[PDB]
Design a binder for this molecule. Structure first.
Ligand SMILES: [Cl-]
Ligand SMILES: [Cl-]
Ligand SMILES: [Cl-]
Ligand SMILES: [Cl-]
Ligand SMILES: [Cl-]
Ligand SMILES: [Cl-]
Ligand SMILES: [Cl-]
Lengths: 227, 213, 213
């Protein structure tokens, strides 16, 4: 669909602008809660605990059927929060996330068809990679901020280090197996911007109403990454 | 071409372990298949490591008609055709080549291609595939990697192969989206070459009892 | 353009270890090349990750016309052409990009692209490439992964690079399909920058003796 006044060049510039905006937010935040939610309504207490404990960011995974409604609820409850959608496998999901109010999408792997879709609809994508060939594919599409996933199972910090060496332009968001015990090892790598983590918002705590624990874990990581 | 994947998925889920066979002399598939079948494991993935694989599939299908027979190391459509004509009902590739997958669709045989990371999984899903080989399983990160793939991709079902042994197979089978694992240990070429039929029978009975107690 | 891969493979096979050089000051390549050659390793893969790489290739080719010189970190055809014009014998890439491979064909320079899993191997094989860099070797699963790849893909010849040291190189070289490994330890930035020519010479003599006794 064509918007009056918007040519292909403007769409490209817009996508670049959105990439820069997201990059700067990630670099400041350093840790992104990765949220898998059963009941959409649970996103409200969870967003409140995150925000009031100093972590105004959430990536809601489309692995749950509740994801789109959760994004819509959180967006309304927490206007200032950085909200992303994860597990985005195609352009239809990307669009649904955008409509609901997300300002970036993340995918577990790299699919150029998903990337082209996001570049067209004007939502930043940070796609998952785990080897040099996939990094090269992403670079060729003009992306530089990539998710590194699954981080620990793909070789952890030694893989990150091996991986960023040849590619000076990339910035990574390692996700998968990140905990308070290893997050600083990742963040020590200059080309790592932020890590994704589930432990501070773990489904086991959410489903069992353990809001005080979520709060404690959130405060702990916020202090740890930006002391 | 009507896909037999629902049938294959069910057979794999029942078997839990698929012998991955590298045969030197095709004739050797006959006693090997007899030992596998009579010890409770009526399945075989015959790898295309040499021309002898084609004859082996043909001999095995004649000797053990109800055996689940796949062909492995299938790198192109020509080999997929050779396997189909020999009597295999599915092919397996170590990695994912969409040109091979397309060729298999055209010639009409099911393929279970190998993947080992999220991007390759997404490539397969985009071509309509959901049953995938996870290879090489241990060298790619093992159960930790398997859990990372099945997690985001609820539709996939995996056949981990590579470094699977009786000491680690239970951990893989404990993951619901794992259908079965491929294993060479009970059909190791050394055992076949040396005619260690009693030992092959023992390893086969032992694994069948282990996975299907 | 007739490919020199035959010659390249023979040279790699003879050398067994290839210095992977990230150079800060192009002029450093002259003494470094001399020390490497005079101590038995007349080869260098100079990475384009360094701004000095093109000038270093030119200087080294003039100073050591018989040196095997590879240009590393080649991500597109523009760089490949720059490498060819500078005097490189071949180009190396950390991963596999069909666009780079196509450009190298056009330009007329051999490429040894990087791979680390079966799907990427199949992609390379489908473009007619058989000599491949296995990178990053240790972080991708090391010798267990190498064994997993060379098994189903008998035609490939590998150059493992990434985490290789005198303590682990023999384990790679013991695999028949491994031609040579890339290593940075004998040309480490710290040594080259600080002009530790005697230490570079020692390390070079030591590995040459180790792999070619
Ligand atoms: Cl994701
Ligand atoms: Cl992980
Ligand atoms: Cl296979
Ligand atoms: Cl393995
Ligand atoms: Cl390289
Ligand atoms: Cl890949
Ligand atoms: Cl490494």
């Amino acid at each position: 669909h064509h918007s009056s006044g918007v040519d292909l060049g403007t769409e490209n510039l817009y996508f670049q602008s959105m990439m820069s905006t997201i990059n700067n937010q990630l670099k400041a935040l350093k840790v992104i809660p990765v949220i898998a939610i059963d009941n959409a309504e649970d996103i409200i207490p969870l967003g409140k605990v995150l925000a009031e404990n100093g972590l105004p960011a959430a990536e809601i995974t489309f692995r749950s059927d509740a994801a789109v409604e959760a994004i819509r609820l959180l967006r309304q409850a927490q206007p200032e929060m950085l909200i992303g959608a994860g597990t985005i496998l195609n352009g239809e999901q990307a669009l649904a996330a955008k409509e609901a109010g997300a300002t970036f999408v993340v995918s577990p792997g790299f699919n150029p068809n998903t990337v082209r879709a996001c570049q067209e609809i004007g939502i930043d994508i940070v796609p998952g990679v785990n080897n040099p060939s996939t990094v090269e594919a992403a670079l060729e599409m003009g992306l530089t901020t990539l998710k590194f996933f699954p981080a620990e199972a793909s070789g952890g910090i030694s893989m990150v280090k091996s991986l960023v060496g040849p590619y000076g332009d990339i910035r990574l968001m390692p996700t998968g197996g990140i905990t308070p015990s290893n997050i600083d090892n990742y963040l020590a790598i200059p080309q790592v911007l932020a890590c994704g983590g589930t432990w501070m918002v773990d489904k086991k705590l959410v489903t069992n109403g353990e809001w005080d624990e979520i709060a404690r874990l959130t405060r702990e990581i916020v202090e740890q990454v930006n002391p």
